[PDB]
Amino acid sequence: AGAKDIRSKIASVQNTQKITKAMEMVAASKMRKSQDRMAASRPYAETMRKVIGHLAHGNLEYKHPYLEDRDVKRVGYLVVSTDRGLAGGLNINLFKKLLAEMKTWTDKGVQADLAMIGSKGVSFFNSVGGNVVAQVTGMGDNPSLSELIGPVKVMLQAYDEGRLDKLYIVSNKFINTMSQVPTISQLLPLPASDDDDLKHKSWDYLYEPDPKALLDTLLRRYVESQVYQGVVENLASEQAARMVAMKAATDNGGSLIKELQLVYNKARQASITQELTEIVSGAA
């Protein structure tokens, strides 16, 4: 033991607990901003996916590489992550689940191409040994699709030059203010829908310009919108996880204070007793 050093540790832990409380404040405010931005993003992606859903079952159809169900030789993943710590184990769980599915493809002899949106993902997968083909880091407090387009542009080129056959996006769903889950979702080759063809409503704009080029542009927009909503939702999840972790750290700091103080009190009492015993005995 020792009185001054224990009291120094008590002061330091007190200060750290106060700081963790403040960091919880910051995390909560950032979550508010992130969730309202998510609310803005939701309708646009929702409507666009409804569009492509009805295109999944239309008549007077024609082929498109992003539409057909081609075989899988290699798989692409668009991975979102934080660039910061103190967010609990969100990134770890998402990385583990992606590693599980990538292992499943590796069993089948199917290779994985990875594009990272965060620094933690870059570090984790370059040190573990995943083939990072694209990467962007440090997006900022307000993220924008403009900077994220580049990695998506690379992945799109990988698909449209024929090398990449199936493409997935991985992100954490903002299920609630206090609950989230990591997910892997089918992105580029169009997923299934429940419908039959709607024969007619208004005018078939299709052949006013070229159908192929316009459909190309539309599916570009579709993939970009999906990616943007995923990123925004993951930032909301990040703020939630950080606030939970900060609360836990605050409680643990209080727990250490209430015990270091017992050690300090016993130390003070014992020291005073020893010194007084020396004085009284030395009187002789």
């Binding site: 007077l60 709607l198 409503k201 208004s202 005018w203």
Partner: protein
């Protein structure tokens, strides 16, 4: 009848049940009605009318986008779109002032590629603001 949805790519513009509409298109304005055709493409700067149950309309600015047309529930994907009472005649007149300046301030084809779009956006605002008075 049928259902319609509109988004401004960073905002939802409309969602609900509807009877009939009138909208812009790949080349110009167009009179739309329900049940006619199954295919879809792009939008030039314009506007849209939304007549709902009991015959109640509304008037929305469409700065640019894509239109589905074919489905029972249809939607408009707009890169930018503004609600008919978020915008106003003063705002469209400011757009008129901007565009009439830029016509005088654009002198090459490369810059007119943007000046023409600015003028089209202003003219679309100026038509939706008049249709808004109904």
């Amino acid at each position: 009848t049928y259902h319609l949805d509109v988004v401004s790519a960073e905002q939802q513009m409309f969602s609900g049940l509807v009877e009939k509409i009138q909208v812009t298109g790949s080349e110009g304005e167009l009179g739309i009605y329900p049940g006619h055709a199954p295919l879809l493409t792009a939008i030039k700067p314009g506007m849209i009318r939304i007549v709902k149950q009991h015959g109640h309309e509304e008037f929305i600015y469409l700065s640019g986008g894509i239109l589905e047309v074919q489905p029972g529930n249809v939607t408009v994907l707009a890169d930018t779109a503004i609600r008919g009472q978020d915008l106003d005649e003063a705002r469209a007149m400011e757009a008129k002032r901007k565009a009439e300046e830029h016509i005088s301030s654009s002198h090459g084809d490369v810059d007119y590629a943007q000046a023409s779009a600015e003028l089209a956006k202003a003219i679309a605002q100026l038509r939706v603001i008049e249709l808004t008075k109904k």
